[PDB]
Each structure stands twice: as C-alpha cells, then as structure tokens.
Copies of this chain bind each other. A is one copy, B any other.
Amino acid sequence: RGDDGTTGLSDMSRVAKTDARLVAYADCDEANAAIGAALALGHPDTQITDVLRQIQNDLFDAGADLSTPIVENPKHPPLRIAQSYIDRLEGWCDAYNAGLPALKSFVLPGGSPLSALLHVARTVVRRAERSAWAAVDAHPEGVSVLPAKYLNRLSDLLFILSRVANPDGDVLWRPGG
C-alpha cells in the first residue's frame, strides 16, 4: 500500500493514483475529450469552434494549476488559472444567452449531435468541478480554488451553448408526467 500505484505531480513529488489532485486534473482531461467529441461529431459553426478550442486550451492551464502544488516563493512563477479566465467565460455566457427564450424548467438533453454532446460535456465538466473542490478540501493551502470556479462557469456556458445548438428547441421535463 509501494511504488506500484503511484505517479508524479508536476514538481516530481510522488502521489497515489487515487490522489485528489490527480483525480481533479484527470477529470479535466476527460472533460477536454468530451468537448473534442462535441467538435468532431457535432459540426459546429466557426465561432463556436473557436470558443470551444479556447476552452480546451484553458483546461490544460487548469490541469497545470492543479498538478502544481502552491508554494511560498517558487523557483519560477507557476502557470495558474486567473480571474480573467472566468470573466471571459462569463462574457461568453452573457452573449450566447441573449437570444435564448426564458426557461422555466429542466430540458431533456439531446437534439442534434452537437447539442447532445454539449450536454455530455456539461455533465463531465460538472464532475470535474466536484473533483476540483475535493482537491481543495484535501489541500486547502496547496490547491487553488480558481480551477473549480472556472469549471463551475464552464458548465453554465456549455448549458447555454447546448440550447443555442439544439434544433429541437427546449424539450421540457414534465414532473411525474
């Protein structure tokens, strides 16, 4: 309970394959792959493609952050998620939500390949957010909360974009119906 089953963080330090930090950046990888599948199978417009590819780049920045313990006075300044990343996601949320009708209930996920795979990506990003909070909980001084805050806003954006993309419009949940 030995080197089998261990691996390294970005500073080379050794962690279990079940380490909370690693689980968080692994789930960012899984989210990034879900976004790649939305791009590859969904056929998005050029503008949505550019947004999603920036997000895929951002997710590696988030994994770099999560994989790099916070230390006092580091050798060289680490790559970290900054508030500016979240401000950018919010700007996109506002712009893409402007034309959507008001929604009063849950929507059944699906629609076009693109809208359905943006819902898949949304749910995987939300899973990554939970893992990112668990990493902060395990290392309150050594892990940034900004990766988790980024993933939180990203799932808002992916919901909005699934609605933009959906040719079925909003198919509403009917509670108990």
Contacts and interface: CB of A to CB of B under 8 A. Distances in A.
Nearest to A5: B133
B175 A17 contact: no
A18 B137 contact: yes
B56 A111 contact: no
A140 B109 contact: no
A51 to B, nearest CB: 13
A163 to B, nearest CB: 13
Contact of A40 (B53, B57, B115, B177): B115
How many copies of this protein are present in the complex? 3
Nearest to A130: B17
Contacts of A35: 109-110
A28 to B, nearest CB: 10
B41 A113 contact: yes
User: Interface of chain A, helix or strand or loop or mixed?
Assistant: helix
Contacts of A61: 175-176
Given A41-B113, A79-B175, A108 B30 contact: no
Interface string A29-52: 110111111011100000000000
Q: Give the size category of A's interface with B.
A: 35 or more
- Which of A16, A108, A133 has most B Cβ within 10 Å? A108
A23 B118 CA distance: 20
A70 to B, nearest CB: 16
A35 to B, nearest CB: 8
Interface of A: 1, 4-5, 16-18, 22-23, 26, 29-30, 32-37, 39-41, 53, 56-57, 60-61, 64, 79, 106, 108-113, 115-117, 119-120, 122-124, 126-127, 129-130, 133-134, 136-137, 140, 145, 148, 171, 173-177
